[PDB]
Amino acid sequence: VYAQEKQDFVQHFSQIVRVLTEDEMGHPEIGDAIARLKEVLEYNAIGGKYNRGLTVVVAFRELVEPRKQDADSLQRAWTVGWCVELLQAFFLVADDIMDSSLTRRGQICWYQKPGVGLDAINDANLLEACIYRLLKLYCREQPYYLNLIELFLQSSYQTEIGQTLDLLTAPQGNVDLVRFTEKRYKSIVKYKTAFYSFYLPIAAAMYMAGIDGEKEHANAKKILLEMGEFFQIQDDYLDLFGDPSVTGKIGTDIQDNKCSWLVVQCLQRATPEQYQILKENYGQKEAEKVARVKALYEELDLPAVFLQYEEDSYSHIMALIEQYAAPLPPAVFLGLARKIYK
Amino acid sequence: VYAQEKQDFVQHFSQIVRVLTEDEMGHPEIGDAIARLKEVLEYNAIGGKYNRGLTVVVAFRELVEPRKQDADSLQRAWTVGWCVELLQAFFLVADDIMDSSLTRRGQICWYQKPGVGLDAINDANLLEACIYRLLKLYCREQPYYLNLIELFLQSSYQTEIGQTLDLLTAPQGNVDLVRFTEKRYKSIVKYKTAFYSFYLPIAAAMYMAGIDGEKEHANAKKILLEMGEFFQIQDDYLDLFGDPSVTGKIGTDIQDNKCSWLVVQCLQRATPEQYQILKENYGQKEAEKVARVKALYEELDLPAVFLQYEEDSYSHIMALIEQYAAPLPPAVFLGLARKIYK
Ligand SMILES: O=C(O)c1cc2c(-c3cccc4[nH]ccc34)cccc2[nH]1
Numbered sequence: 001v002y003a004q005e006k007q008d009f010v011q012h013f014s015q016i017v018r019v020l021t022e023d024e025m026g027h028p029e030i031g032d033a034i035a036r037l038k039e040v041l042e043y044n045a046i047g048g049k050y051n052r053g054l055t056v057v058v059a060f061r062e063l064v065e066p067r068k069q070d071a072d073s074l075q076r077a078w079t080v081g082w083c084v085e086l087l088q089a090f091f092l093v094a095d096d097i098m099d100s101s102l103t104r105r106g107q108i109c110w111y112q113k114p115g116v117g118l119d120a121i122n123d124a125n126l127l128e129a130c131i132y133r134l135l136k137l138y139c140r141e142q143p144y145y146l147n148l149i150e151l152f153l154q155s156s157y158q159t160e161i162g163q164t165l166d167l168l169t170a171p172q173g174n175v176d177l178v179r180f181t182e183k184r185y186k187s188i189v190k191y192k193t194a195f196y197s198f199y200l201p202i203a204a205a206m207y208m209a210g211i212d213g214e215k216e217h218a219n220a221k222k223i224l225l226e227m228g229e230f231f232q233i234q235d236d237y238l239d240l241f242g243d244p245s246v247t248g249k250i251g252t253d254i255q256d257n258k259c260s261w262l263v264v265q266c267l268q269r270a271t272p273e274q275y276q277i278l279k280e281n282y283g284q285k286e287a288e289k290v291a292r293v294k295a296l297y298e299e300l301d302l303p304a305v306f307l308q309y310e311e312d313s314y315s316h317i318m319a320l321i322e323q324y325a326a327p328l329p330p331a332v333f334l335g336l337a338r339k340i341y342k
Numbered sequence: 343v344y345a346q347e348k349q350d351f352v353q354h355f356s357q358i359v360r361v362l363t364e365d366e367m368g369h370p371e372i373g374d375a376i377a378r379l380k381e382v383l384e385y386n387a388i389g390g391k392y393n394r395g396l397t398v399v400v401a402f403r404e405l406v407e408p409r410k411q412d413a414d415s416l417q418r419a420w421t422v423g424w425c426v427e428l429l430q431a432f433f434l435v436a437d438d439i440m441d442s443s444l445t446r447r448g449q450i451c452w453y454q455k456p457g458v459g460l461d462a463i464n465d466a467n468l469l470e471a472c473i474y475r476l477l478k479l480y481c482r483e484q485p486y487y488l489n490l491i492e493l494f495l496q497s498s499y500q501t502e503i504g505q506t507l508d509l510l511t512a513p514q515g516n517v518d519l520v521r522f523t524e525k526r527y528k529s530i531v532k533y534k535t536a537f538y539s540f541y542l543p544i545a546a547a548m549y550m551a552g553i554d555g556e557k558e559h560a561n562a563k564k565i566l567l568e569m570g571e572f573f574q575i576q577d578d579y580l581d582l583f584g585d586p587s588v589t590g591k592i593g594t595d596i597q598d599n600k601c602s603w604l605v606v607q608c609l610q611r612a613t614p615e616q617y618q619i620l621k622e623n624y625g626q627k628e629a630e631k632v633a634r635v636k637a638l639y640e641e642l643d644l645p646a647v648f649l650q651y652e653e654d655s656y657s658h659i660m661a662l663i664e665q666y667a668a669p670l671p672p673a674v675f676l677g678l679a680r681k682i683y684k
């Protein structure tokens with residue numbers, strides 16, 4: 001469903017850019033600013049998997065009657081999908097600055113580019129501003145206009161709350177495993193990742209479909225927030241125990257003192273002696289010390305604890321879909337679950 | 343009109359904070375994040391003159407029938423005023439990071455506080471998020487709800503475009519006076535300062551009053567953008583030639599290579615020889631070199647050029663009010679003009 005649509009979705013970015021840089025036509029005074037906005041969009045919104053944005057298009061196709069899927073209805077779906085990608089681009093540009101990252105998707109972080117620096121704070125704000133410009137240009141006259149504006153604003157706020165919670169839990173220069181609890185971990189995931197990655201794209205498609213009822217959204221939110229929790233737990237597991245060939249990424253979470261699912265479980269299972277070993281090696285760059293944590297996790301059989309959690313989670317999500325999908329087609333959630341699991 | 347109201351406006355901040363930190367009641371998982379949000383609001387939204395926020399309250403009182411100014415109508419006016427102050431707080435926190443500032447209103451910039459740093463990027467985003475949270479909490483059921491959401495979003499976008507234009511014109515490490523033109527200067531002022539400082543607070547009061555017509559807003563915008571241009575030109579003049587006792591501030595614009603109105607005029611009047619002297623001394627910290635530019639400005643009689651510009655501007659604004667205030671009470675604009683001029 002995603003692999004087919006990917007092409008039409010990615011092809012729509014050129015229109016998105018044209019429409020956003022068409023501001024220059026009526027006002028050539030701001031041309032230089034608009035030229036810069038084009039660079040920011042082209043560097044930061046391109047090069048990812050587009051999964052979150054594609055979820056909007058896929059869910060729109062499964063929620064709306066095919067006879068109501070005219071040229072313009074699909075044009076708005078592609079735009080709302082691109083808005084999800086612009087919300088993400090805004091968060092990533094800013095997160096890379098805050099955590100002093102070097103690369104993003106194997107390429108140099110926008111702020112690390114010569115002549116950019118802390119100016120990327122304004123660039124990230126412009127990416128955020130584009131969402132609302134696009135919603136106005138494409139959805140101003142639609143009955144769900146306000147619903148979409150509120151959903152993007154609430155998604156921004158939850159993610160920012162999640163980011164605060166995260167920054168409070170793992171300060172740069174503070175190696176305290178006492179604040180690394182399961183309850184705290186689950187809260188960071190819900191707010192920082194699960195709302196915008198899973199709930200936002202389905203809820204956007206739902207409003208575009210005329211499904212605006214609090215019950216339906218509460219039901220969809222219950223499935224999606226649980227999918228978001230597994231997604232991140234899996235991401236924290238794959239970070240260390242995942243093969244770097246298949247994943248296309250190499251693990252760093254231990255070196256960065258992250259409130260990872262792996263450390264949360266380790267802390268729950270470590271004896272006072274085992275706690276001390278983790279208290280020393282966690283947060284250090286050295287390949288000998290990083291090897292010690294991997295060995296401690298392996299010793300506490302966390303890959304098995306994960307394998308069990310994965311089976312329990314899939315079972316739970318299927319019961320969740322069964323109980324809360326109606327009146328939405330279960331295939332809306334089954335599509336995501338197939339992609340997230342294994 | 344401002345001095346009376348200031349007290350009721352500032353007293354409303356405690357309610358604003360209570361209402362914004364009441365999120366913690368239903369969700370104690372995010373309590374730590376909410377505690378941090380309270381600190382950000384209390385440090386960054388307090389300590390200024392509140393002029394922009396007060397303009398909302400003053401204009402609301404002059405545009406709405408006193409019989410329609412019930413307890414709740416004034417409660418919403420105070421909140422919308424505080425939203426203007428939160429939009430400003432968001433821009434200042436971010437601008438201080440981008441231009442590496444040390445102090446703001448004689449106190450240490452939020453990002454410069456120990457244990458804050460680049461985390462202030464998220465804090466600035468939260469300040470921005472609060473506007474929309476307050477508009478929802480107070481104005482959700484009002485007919486101008488969407489009008490206010492769009493106005494704040496468009497004000498954010500114009501300011502960000504203005505900031506880009508500014509960052510492009512004066513790069514940190516690039517002393518090029520060729521890009522410092524009057525047309526560019528006027529564009530930076532319109533976008534970065536005039537829209538949110540003058541148009542936004544009057545337009546907010548106008549929508550709350552039921553005045554939503556494009557004509558009325560276009561007419562109000564014509565006066566307000568010209569007031570915003572004089573305000574900044576005056577600010578650039580006072581920066582150097584203003585008495586630091588009366589102003590309560592000391593000049594730094596020359597040291598920072600700012601696209602100031604003073605340099606724009608200097609460049610328009612400087613001979614090829616005079617251009618070279620400015621080409622050397624502008625952007626340097628040294629008190630001997632800073633004294634050389636002040637002397638060059640004085641030699642080119644820029645304080646007189648300003649004095650003439652000020653009289654021409656006041657004359658123009660009064661003709662503007664006369665031609666474009668109707669059907670609004672001219673006292674809405676006359677109040678601002680009295681405050682801006684002298
Ligand atoms: O970050 C990535 O590159 C990435 C995302 C994802 C997702 C994913 C995440 C959020 C919403 C989704 N909807 C549809 C897929 C998906 C799933 C699998 C691998 C993935 N890799």
Ligand SMILES: O=C(O)c1cc2c(-c3cccc4[nH]ccc34)cccc2[nH]1
Nearest residue numbers: 390391393394397539540573678681682
């Ligand atoms: O920045 C300051 O401290 C400051 C603002 C101002 C303003 C001002 C600016 C924008 C909108 C306004 N509405 C009402 C007043 C006002 C005017 C005079 C001195 C000032 N000092």
